Design a protein around this ligand. Structure first.
Ligand SMILES: O=c1[nH]cnc2c(C[N@@H+]3C[C@H](CO)[C@@H](O)C3)c[nH]c12
Ligand SMILES: O=c1[nH]cnc2c(C[N@@H+]3C[C@H](CO)[C@@H](O)C3)c[nH]c12
Ligand SMILES: O=c1[nH]cnc2c(C[N@@H+]3C[C@H](CO)[C@@H](O)C3)c[nH]c12
Ligand SMILES: O=c1[nH]cnc2c(C[N@@H+]3C[C@H](CO)[C@@H](O)C3)c[nH]c12
Lengths: 154, 154, 154, 152
C-alpha cells in the first residue's frame, strides 16, 4: 500500500494559488511514490448549494486526517492558516507522521529554537525536527529529509 | 472531582492582555466549579534560560490537552491563534469537550454557516454547535449554554 | 492647544479588549496633556443600523488622521491590524508624528533590524527609532522616550 | 507618458509565490500599456549585507509610492499583508489611484458592506467601489473595470 499524505494548505482559497501552487507540490509528493489526498480537490463532490456543506467538508476532512499516514502541512503565511493548524493538531494527537512546508522567509515565532509558534513542532522529535521542515518545493524530493527516510524505513 | 478545562488563548503574548484579560475568564470558569488549566501560568517552572524551553513547553501543553476534560479556546483575532488551533485540533482528535470563545465581532470565515473557518467546528455537533460558542465573558456562566449543561449532565 | 494623538488599535473589535485595554492607554496618554482621538469612541454617534455606516467610519477616520498631530499605533498581533496599518501609512505620507506600541513579545518580521515588517518604520529615523517604540503601557509616560520629548519640543 | 502602477503584494515573501504568482499579474497590467513597479524586483540593487538594507528598502518603497500614478494592491490573505496596507495608506493619503485585487474567497471583514476591513476602501468612492476591486487575474484586462477606464 502507498503511504498516504494529507496535503493541508490554504492555497485552495485563492483562485491563482489553487491553480498554480498546489499541482507542483502534489507532483513532488507523487514523485516519491506517495498517494496525495488534497482536500480542496477531494471535496469536489460535496453539494455546495446546500447549507450544511461546511459541516460536510469539516467531517470529510476530519475523516481524511484520521485515515492518512502523514500530513504535509503548508504553513506559509503570518500566521499559518487556522484550518491547517487544526488539522495539524489532529495529526499530532493521532500519531500521524508530520511534515511541515514553509518557503515564506518571514520569521513568525514565539521562541529562538523554532521558526514558528512552538506548538507546531510538538509532534516532532526533540532532535532532528528540522529534517521534517521543508523550505522549498525542490527540497521535497531530497533523500536527506524525513519524507524519503519515511519511505525507505530509515 | 472537578472537570478540568484547558484555557487556550494568545493572551499570554501581550503583557497587558495577560494581566487584564485572562483573570476574568479564569474566574468565570472557576465560578462554574471548573478546575482551570491556563498554560501561560502553568509553565512557570520551566527554565527559560535553557535553549530547549520551547520544546519543553510544547510537550507540557500537549500533555495538558491529553489530560484535560475539555478545552476552552479563545479564538479571537483575524485569524485565530495558530497555537490555539493546534491545541484545538488535538482536543478534537482526543474526543475532549470543545468550547469556543470569540468576543471579536469581525467575521473571518470561508463559509456561511459558521463565523470562522469551518475546521474549528469539526469537533462540535452538526446541530446546536452555537451552544458551545461564547461571545462574551458574561455569557460563560449561562445555564443555557454548553459548559453548564456539561456540568449538570444535560 | 494640546497636541492631538490618533490612537489606532484593533482593541475596539473585542468586547473585553475595548472595555479593559483601551482606557488605561487613553489615560496614560491624557496624563501627558495629549488630546486623544480614539476612533471607536469617536464614532459612537454613527448610526450603525444604517448601511452606509462603514463608509462614514472610513471617512471619519481618514479625516482624523489628516487632522491629528501624531499617531500612536498599537501594533500588537501577528500580523499587526490591517486598518491600523492603513492609518499608519496615511500618517507617514502626511508627515505626522509616529509612535508605535507593541507589548506582544512574538516576532513577526521580514528583516533582522526591526521586530516587525520594515514598512512600519518608514516614517521613523534610521537611528534611534527605538525611542519611538513603546513596549509597555508603563513606558508611555517616560520622559526619556520620544512622545514626551515631542510634546515638550526637546 | 505611460501611467505607473505600484504592484503591492506579499508574494515576494514565498519562493514559489514570487516565481509563479507575480509574473502573470505583471503581464496582465503591462498588456494594458501600464508601466509596472514591482517592489521585490526593484529592490534587487540594494546591498543586502549592509546592515541598513531594511531601512533602505523601506525608503525606496516609500519613494516609489510617492512617484507612482496608482497602486494595485494584492490584498489576499487573512488579514491582508501589513506592508501592503502601509503602502495602501500612503497611496490614499497621496491621492494616488487605488485598485484592489483579491481572488481569495474568504471574508475577513468588520462590516457588512465590504469584504475586508472598511479602511481599505477609504480611498475608493462610496458607490461603485466594486469597479476598482478585482477578484481574478483574468479580470484585470476587463474594459468594464476601473483600471482600463482610468487609462482613458
Ligand atoms: O472550502 C474548503 N474546501 C475544502 N476544505 C476546506 C477546509 C478544511 N481544510 C483546512 C485547510 C484550509 O483552512 C485545508 O487543509 C482545507 C476549510 N475550508 C475548505
Ligand atoms: O510562550 C508560550 N508560553 C506558554 N505556552 C505557549 C504556547 C502553547 N499554547 C498555544 C497558545 C498560544 O499560541 C496558548 O494556549 C499557549 C505557545 N507559546 C507559548
Ligand atoms: O468599527 C469601527 N469603528 C471605528 N473605527 C473603525 C475602523 C477604522 N480604524 C482601523 C483600526 C482598526 O482596524 C482602528 O484604528 C480603527 C475599522 N472599524 C472601525
Ligand atoms: O523584502 C522585501 N522586499 C521588497 N519590498 C519589501 C517590503 C515593502 N513592501 C511591503 C509589501 C510586503 O510587506 C510589498 O508591497 C513590499 C517589505 N519587505 C520587503
Amino acid at each position: 500500500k502507498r503511504k498516504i499524505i494529507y496535503l493541508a494548505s490554504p492555497y485552495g482559497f485563492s483562485q491563482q494559488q489553487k491553480t498554480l501552487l498546489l499541482p507542483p507540490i502534489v507532483r513532488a509528493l507523487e514523485a516519491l511514490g506517495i498517494e496525495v489526498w488534497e482536500p480542496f480537490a477531494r471535496n469536489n463532490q460535496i453539494d455546495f448549494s446546500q447549507a450544511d456543506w461546511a459541516y460536510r467538508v469539516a467531517q470529510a476532512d476530519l475523516q481524511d486526517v484520521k485515515n492518512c499516514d502523514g500530513i504535509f502541512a503548508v504553513v506559509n503565511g503570518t500566521p499559518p492558516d487556522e484550518g491547517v493548524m487544526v488539522e495539524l493538531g489532529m495529526a499530532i494527537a493521532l500519531n500521524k507522521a508530520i511534515f511541515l512546508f514553509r518557503d515564506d522567509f518571514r520569521r513568525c515565532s514565539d521562541n529562538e529554537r523554532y521558526p514558528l509558534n512552538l506548538m507546531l513542532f510538538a509532534g516532532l522529535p526533540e532532535i532532528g525536527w528540522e529534517n521534517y521542515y521543508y523550505t522549498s518545493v525542490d527540497e521535497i524530493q531530497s533523500h536527506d529529509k524525513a519524507l524519503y527516510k519515511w519511505l525507505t524505513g530509515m
